[PDB]
Amino acid sequence: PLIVPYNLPLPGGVVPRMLITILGTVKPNANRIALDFQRGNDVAFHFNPRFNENNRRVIVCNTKLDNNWGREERQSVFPFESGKPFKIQVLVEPDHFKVAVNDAHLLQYNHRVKKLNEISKLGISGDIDLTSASYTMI
Ligand SMILES: OC[C@H]1O[C@H](Sc2cccc(F)c2)[C@H](O)[C@@H](n2cc(-c3cc(F)c(F)c(F)c3)nn2)[C@H]1O
């Protein structure tokens, strides 16, 4: 496969029990990946692996409102690897997005944007070959 940046419409927005699954392969020498769950121009949940931020690998999560980024949430568990296939699962729970990578729980992100049914697209960008992006209800 899919052309990146890729937009996945989320019809009717997100809801608890919605599971988003992304399969792809990290490019060689990758620098960054981003998932953006968007409410119009706002970013309800930005999930941003950085492969070299001051020679550290970190995942940064945040929300963008009226073009302003908020407080970053950082996770040093870093399950992505240059050149290698991955699976990202994002499960919407009532109070957070819950993210697992390669079947291992990674992080949770508390809902700051509370109008879940207005979060109706997911952007996928950065240094990946994107194989598939889909959703289902569990
Ligand atoms: O806080 C989160 C943000 O941090 C900074 S801005 C900032 C600085 C200090 C404190 C703070 F709160 C915010 C970044 O520049 C922000 N970013 C990253 C990408 C982006 C685009 C792409 F096309 C990709 F492919 C990609 F992987 C990432 N767009 N925007 C975002 O990550």
Strand order from edge to edge, sheet including 85-92: 104-110, 96-101, 85-92, 18-26, 128-137
How does 49-85 read in b/e, with b if 16+ C-beta sit within 10 Å?
A: bbbeeeeebbbbbbbbeeeeeeeebebeeebbeeeee
Residue nearest atom 19 of ligand 1, based on CA coordinates:
34
What is the C-alpha separation between 110 and 98, in angstroms, rounded?
A: 9
Domains of the chain, earliest start first: 1-138 (2.60.120.200)
Partner residues linked to 123 by β-bridges? 7, 36
Distance 138 CA to ligand 1 centre (A): 31
Resolution (A): 1.1
Experimental method: X-ray
What is the C-alpha separation between 91 and 89, in angstroms, rounded?
A: 6
R_g (Cα) of the chain, nearest Å: 14
Residue nearest atom 6 of ligand 1, based on CA coordinates:
69
Partner residues linked to 55 by β-bridges? none
Q: Are strands 128-137 and 56-65 parallel, antiparallel or unpaired?
A: unpaired
Q: Pocket residues for ligand 1 (CB within 6 Å)?
A: 32-34, 46, 48, 60, 62, 69, 72, 125-126
The SS3 of residue 107 is strand
**Which among 31, 62, 127 is the best mutation to test ligand 1's pocket, defined by most ligand atoms within 8 Å of the CB?**
62
- Length of the chain equals 138
Of the CA atoms within 13 Å of residue 138, those in its CB half-sphere come to 12
Contact present, 65 and 83 (Cβ < 8 Å)? no
Distance 123 CA to ligand 1 centre (A): 13
Please state, as a whole number, how many other Cβ atoms lie within 10 Å of the Cβ of residue 108: 15
Atom of ligand 1 nearest to the CA of 70: 12
The SS3 of residue 56 is strand
Distance 133 CA to ligand 1 centre (A): 22
Longest Cα–Cα distance in the chain: 40
